[PDB]
Design a binder for these strands. Structure first.
Ligand code: NA
Lengths: 67, 66, 65, 68
DNA sequence: GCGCCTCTGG
DNA sequence: CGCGCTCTG
């Protein structure tokens, strides 16, 4: 579908924005109304940015284990 | 410790108060010339970065199927 | 409800949000035809609203100047 | 050289003319890591028109609070 | 929440 | 954290 859950309250969602698709990695929350709303912590990537994130996982995992 | 993914977009692996942070963030340039982290960004713990990679295929399936 | 239009799609609201607040906000249209409030707003308690009212004269001078 | 009017602990009413458009902004401020006072997300900028209609509605707004 | 300053700060 | 598609202490 649209949503792919990565944290207890964080999802990476795919969405078509007028032909241009955005890969949005965002944290969510709920208002006093009980409905789920998005938050400030997040970012929407284009496909190229998403492609360049995947080919950087090499150094990402390496940098994580070096500290 | 930073890995670029966009024009002003970088993935920084850092240590903030004992725990490791994986920050996907967009930066901005000051008038003096240096870059500062901006509002658009999120920092994942190793556990959230864990399932992000596991869901990569599902995500790539969806970006094509749209 | 007790809505008070001030602009094109901007209203002021007197609400008892669980506290009495005078909220100035911009609103938008929903695909379901309804009208929803945006995040381009601010809620003022009666204290700040009174202070706001005591300085309109000073602000009206500034806009004229 | 003085165009701001305090209404709260960190809330102010500022006025200016950004490229001919005159705005009367009511919002809350914050402090950045550079030690400077910056406007915040809680607020709204009004044109003189919306500023006039706000004043012409203060009557009913004041007694709507009293009814609550 | 998702061109350009009299702007942009995890 | 001002000038097409989301509330408030
Ligand atoms: Na920020």
């Amino acid at each position: 579908d649209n949503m792919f859950q990565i944290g207890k309250m964080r999802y990476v969602s795919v969405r078509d924005f007028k032909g241009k698709v955005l890969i949005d990695i965002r944290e969510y929350w709920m208002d006093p109304e009980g409905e789920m709303k998005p938050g400030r912590k997040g970012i929407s990537l284009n496909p190229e940015q998403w492609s360049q994130l995947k080919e950087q996982i090499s150094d990402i995992d390496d940098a994580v284990r070096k500290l």
